[PDB]
């Protein structure tokens, strides 16, 4: 509900107070004090999370009104205040008590508390200082305690709740941090820092634009006339009180150009805006393009002057989002609506924004003319999603007039007259956004330090026009391509265009292409591009033309296809190349952007007509940290959920723990992650919504749901060859268990640059070729290190993915190493190299009908290995007799690394016990050492086969115990029947609780469980590891 909002200078922790009507109607006597919730009229689409409030009766307050302590929000009497709120009483009175709170305090009072000998002295002094009362005090994280001096950091479990001094654990913090000086409430500032002056000519000061529109009910002075925000402008009372007006009735503006007329309004305290500017709708900033930033004027121009235009011409500004044929009906309709709905003020040489809903094709609604209002209700079931400019000429005003620069249009009198083109520069996004104001599906945004190649493309386009045209012309063409196929490369253009104010045309010739049959539809494609562009390219001042998916059109030439079709390809290639230059003849300053998903398929016959190309890689850690910040920022996460309850993350999120551990190689579409989380978080919210113990009144994301989401995203893509980073537990890189473990870390610690920022260009990498423990271990070993000192395990799966097809399979090697390197930091596991089994040309593959894997692997990954960065090998060879030793040598991939199998003296017996753990051994004695009754040289993975046999023996014991219980089940059932029901309906715990007490690991071991290997083959490995494996 809405209630009248008012303020007091009372302390932040004092109770609010409510008008007698609210107190009598909603003061439930089951509670000593009425709890409630507040929200304010925040600007824009979002909303603040509803803040709990505590209140008391006051019969003096006007009907349906609230007083709140100004310092709760940080308001001050130095500026005009708000007047109404969203409120609710907390029905059912239940409110959570916080598990803990953290406080941060200046050094003086911090030390004065920390040196106190007892807890209650600290508590009571805090109570005195801040008027905090146990149980009753409402608190939120980031709440102020005193500006300059102390603040409330965080709360648990919820970010808001009640404090109990006996059970809310109190955490007290100081660090002398200068951030205390940044505590300034919402205001604390002496305005006389601009000293008073008796008169001024124009008060020229910076003009800027809002991040959003302003809802009409916010318009505090509320002029009675129905009139348009498009004429309104908004700023503080500061500077306004330096004029001789408030809520100014008449303002006019010019900045070394034409004049605009505007109306002024005051912005209120809750904003986070600049301390000094005027904020305007973009309708202003369509004038003064990218400049003209500072000058205004105010005078009594008139209350109802300029009331007509006898004739005008109004114009399409033109643009691909405008000039295409099928949108015309709705744009013209909403255009006439813009003039029909009210009188409005216009200037000569002036721009009106108009927006519409796409996909309104075929649907015409307002078939009946006039009648009762309907357009506005559709206009609130609509919400706009594409935006275009219309331009109006000067009015042909009758007779002589001193006013010759501005005019009013209204539904009566003169009609709209359309005219062909009026070319105009699109606004640069850094001067003012537009999408944000209209809340459209938003062009992503960059900071130019972290992404290189956006800066590259920017530097191309920014120079080729504006900075060039002072001199001789220069066209440009660029091709964009990427190894990975979802990299967002099209979105790059959507960005850079708006960033540089480049007028964009974009072409969906991927499929919107008529008959388009490559092998038949002869030339229609070329007509489709040419005749389309020709109708819209002329009289666009800059121009970039962007084609999606050139692989739809261009293709290679091969023996496999009809020469007739090949000559069709030839014709299309040639005419495309000619039209590409023809734009450079007919339409000066045109620039061309191509995009291709696989660079090889465009023949060099076209590729020669590049001016540049860019490899766009998959992003890396610093980029991913930026990109998650985007998706989890408030306004983009919210705007599409129409549900009134807002959504947010909470700042305990670890963007760094996402950035790598959670993100690996993942091929963008992090969107999929954030949406998967948003669903799951919403589910638990609607779960508790079933009148459960509390309702935190906001959807709150949590790290656990991000972890679940990312792990799901690695397996829902079930075809994916990859693997997660953490297949390892209890085995976290125990570098002290043996010397060899003490040396695996060398190959990772060094390229982690901890010894130096290595040159990436001298010493060959100490990649490891692991004999290790030859019999068993290797399956674990690489995974164990990979999780605990590295970051992924995407691995070559070495036996698979050799393509049989003629001359193809080099593609799979080049792809696998590309996909490996595409994750910056982590190894590839390689099985036995017998997965490749390179074997020098004889007694096998014989190097003839197959060479394609090894003939690549000898080279390209060794090139990377010699630059010695990012990616590392950890192969697990056992049978070098099967291999050619063209690798496995000091010249390429050295460090033939051996460990052997421990003879009998092992801590690994203790670690065997430690991993039979997680399941109970009832004995007090550990009884492990009797396993050493095994004859020596035995210590293989069969340790855990023996734990399996012991567990199965416990299972057999409990199985025969339940069989005995079944046999006597007549003791509690009329028959020894229904066993499959009985165990479930009795279920007296006893849930397979483990019985390792029977020590049956020896009872297995004494059988000489022959899956162990102990033969001379082990001696063979043990000797040859030294004799040849070194």
């Amino acid at each position: 509900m809405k209630a009248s909002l008012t303020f007091s200078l009372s302390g932040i922790y004092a109770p609010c107070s409510i008008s007698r009507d609210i107190y009598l109607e909603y003061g439930d006597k089951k509670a000593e004090c009425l709890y409630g919730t507040i929200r304010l009229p925040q600007y824009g689409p979002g909303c603040t999370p509803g803040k709990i409030v505590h209140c008391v009766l006051d019969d003096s307050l006007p009907f349906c009104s609230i007083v709140v302590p100004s310092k709760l929000f940080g308001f001050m009497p130095t500026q005009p205040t708000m007047d109404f709120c969203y409120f609710e009483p907390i029905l059912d009175n239940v409110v959570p008590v916080l598990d803990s709170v953290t406080f941060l305090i200046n050094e003086q009072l911090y030390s004065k508390l920390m040196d106190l000998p007892q807890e209650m002295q600290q508590i009571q002094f805090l109570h005195y200082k801040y008027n905090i009362n146990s149980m009753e005090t409402v608190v939120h994280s980031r709440d102020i305690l005193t500006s300059g001096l102390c603040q409330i950091l965080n709360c648990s479990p919820f970010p808001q709740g009640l404090v109990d001094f006996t059970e809310t654990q109190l955490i007290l913090v100081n660090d002398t941090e200068q951030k205390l000086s940044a505590l300034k409430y919402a205001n604390e500032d002496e305005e006389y820092a601009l000293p008073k002056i008796g008169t001024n000519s124009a008060l020229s000061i910076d003009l800027e634009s809002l991040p959003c529109t302003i809802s009409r009910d916010l318009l505090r002075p509320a002029p009675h006339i129905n009139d348009d925000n498009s004429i309104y402008a908004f700023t503080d009372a500061e500077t306004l009180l330096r004029l001789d007006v408030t809520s100014g009735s008449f303002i006019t503006v010019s900045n070394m150009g034409c004049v605009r007329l505007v109306k002024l309004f005051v912005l209120l305290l809750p904003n986070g805006f600049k301390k000094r500017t005027i904020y305007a709708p973009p309708k202003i900033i369509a004038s003064f393009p990218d400049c003209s930033v500072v000058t205004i004027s105010k005078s009594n121009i008139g209350h109802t002057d300029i009331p007509i235009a006898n004739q005008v011409f109004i114009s399409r500004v033109g643009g691909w989002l405008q000039s295409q044929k099928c949108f015309q009906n709705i744009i013209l309709t909403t255009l006439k609506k813009f003039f029909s709905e009210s009188k409005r003020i216009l200037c000569q040489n002036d721009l009106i924004p108009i927006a519409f809903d796409s996909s309104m094709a075929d649907l015409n609604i307002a078939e009946e003319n006039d009648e009762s209002d309907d357009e506005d209700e559709l206009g609130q079931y609509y919400k706009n999603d594409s935006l275009v400019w219309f331009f109006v000429t000067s009015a042909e005003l009758d007779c002589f007039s001193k006013d010759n620069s501005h005019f009013i249009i209204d539904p009566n009198r003169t009609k709209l007259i359309t005219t062909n083109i009026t070319n105009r520069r699109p606004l640069p996004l850094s001067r003012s956004n537009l999408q944000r104001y209209y809340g459209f599906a938003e062009t992503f945004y960059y900071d130019l330090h972290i992404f290189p190649y956006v800066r590259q493309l920017v530097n191309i386009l920014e120079t080729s026009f504006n900075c060039s045209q002072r001199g001789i012309t220069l066209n440009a063409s660029v091709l964009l391509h990427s190894t990975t196929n979802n990299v967002g490369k099209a979105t790059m253009v959507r960005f850079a265009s708006k960033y540089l104010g480049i007028h964009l045309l974009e072409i969906d010739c991927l499929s919107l292409t008529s008959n388009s049959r490559q092998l038949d539809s002869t030339s229609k494609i070329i007509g489709y591009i040419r005749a389309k562009c020709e109708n819209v390219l002329p009289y666009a001042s800059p121009a970039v033309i962007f084609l999606a998916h050139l692989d739809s059109i261009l293709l290679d030439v091969n023996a496999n296809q009809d020469p007739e079709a090949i000559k069709l390809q030839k014709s299309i290639n040639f005419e495309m190349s000619k039209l590409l230059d023809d734009f450079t003849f007919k339409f000066p300053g045109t620039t061309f952007v191509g995009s291709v998903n696989n660079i090889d398929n465009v023949p060099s016959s076209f590729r020669s007509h590049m001016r540049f190309e860019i490899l766009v890689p998959v992003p890396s850690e610093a980029q991913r940290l930026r990109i998650f910040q985007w998706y989890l920022s408030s306004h983009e996460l919210n705007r599409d959920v129409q549900q009134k309850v807002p959504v947010s993350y909470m700042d305990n999120i670890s963007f760094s723990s996402l950035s790598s551990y959670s993100a690996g190689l993942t091929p963008l579409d992090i969107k999929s992650i954030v949406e998967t989380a948003r669903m799951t978080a919403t589910a638990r919210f609607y779960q508790e919504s079933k009148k459960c113990g509390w309702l935190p009144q906001s959807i709150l994301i949590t790290q656990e749901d991000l972890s679940k989401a990312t792990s799901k995203a690695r397996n829902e893509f079930s075809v994916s060859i990859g693997a997660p980073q953490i297949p390892n537990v209890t085995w976290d890189d125990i570098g002290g268990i043996d010397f060899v473990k003490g040396e695996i870390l060398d190959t990772i610690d060094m390229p982690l640059k901890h010894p130096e920022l290595f040159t990436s260009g001298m010493k060959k990498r100490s990649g490891i070729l692991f004999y290790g423990p030859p019999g068993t271990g290797k399956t674990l070993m690489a995974k164990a290190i990979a999780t605990n000192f590295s970051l992924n395990f995407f691995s070559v799966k070495g036996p698979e993915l050799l393509n049989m097809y003629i001359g193809e399979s080099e593609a799979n090697v080049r792809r696998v190493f590309q996909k490996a390197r595409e994750a910056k930091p982590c190894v590839i596991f390689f099985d036995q190299i017998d997965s490749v089994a390179p074997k020098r040309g004889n007694q096998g593959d014989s190097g003839g009908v197959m060479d394609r894997i090894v003939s690549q692997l000898l080279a390209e990954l060794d090139g990377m290995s010699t630059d010695a960065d990012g990616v590392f090998v950890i192969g697990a060879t056992n049978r070098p007799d099967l291999l050619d030793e063209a690798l496995l040598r000091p010249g390429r991939f050295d460090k033939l690394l051996y460990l052997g199998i421990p003879d009998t003296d092992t801590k690994q017996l203790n670690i065997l016990e430690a991993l039979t753990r997680k399941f109970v051994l009832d004995n007090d004695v550990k009884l492990i050492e009797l396993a050493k009754l095994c004859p020596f040289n035995y210590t293989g993975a069969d340790f855990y086969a023996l734990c399996s046999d012991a567990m199965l023996n416990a299972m057999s014991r409990i199985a025969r115990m339940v069989e005995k219980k079944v046999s006597q089940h007549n003791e509690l059932t009329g028959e020894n029947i229904s066993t499959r029901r009985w165990f479930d309906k009795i279920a007296t715990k006893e849930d397979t609780k483990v019985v390792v007490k029977m020590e049956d690991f020896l009872k297995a071991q004494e059988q000489l469980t022959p899956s162990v290997s102990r033969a001379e083959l082990n001696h063979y490995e043990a000797v040859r590891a030294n004799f040849e494996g070194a």
Partner: protein, 103 residues
């Protein structure tokens, strides 16, 4: 279809046999070159996914879609690659008790 869908508010679409509209031919051999990744049907599928994705990002309440088919993998590559699909189910040969109720 999309035009009607946006009109009727919260709405749902199904396609009883998606294989006919958007099944990639299983032979993987419509052309030997890379453009086998964009035969005519897959071209339709991409157009559809683009339209839907664009309207969906405006307001997720408005349209969902159900695809019924033969084998969850065998529909189409692009359908998974773009993360258009997600939450999923399958029917299984009914158990004896339900089998009795059916009979």
């Amino acid at each position: 279809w999309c035009s009607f869908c946006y009109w009727y508010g919260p709405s749902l679409i199904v396609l009883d046999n998606v294989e006919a509209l958007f099944g990639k031919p299983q032979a993987n051999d419509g052309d030997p070159s890379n453009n086998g990744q964009w035969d005519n049907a897959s071209k339709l599928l991409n157009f559809f996914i683009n339209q839907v994705t664009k309207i969906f990002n405006k307001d997720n309440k408005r349209i969902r879609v159900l695809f019924s088919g033969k084998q969850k993998t065998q529909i189409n590559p692009l359908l998974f690659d773009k993360h258009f699909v997600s939450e999923t189910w399958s029917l299984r040969a009914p158990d004896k008790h339900a089998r009795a109720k059916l009979l």
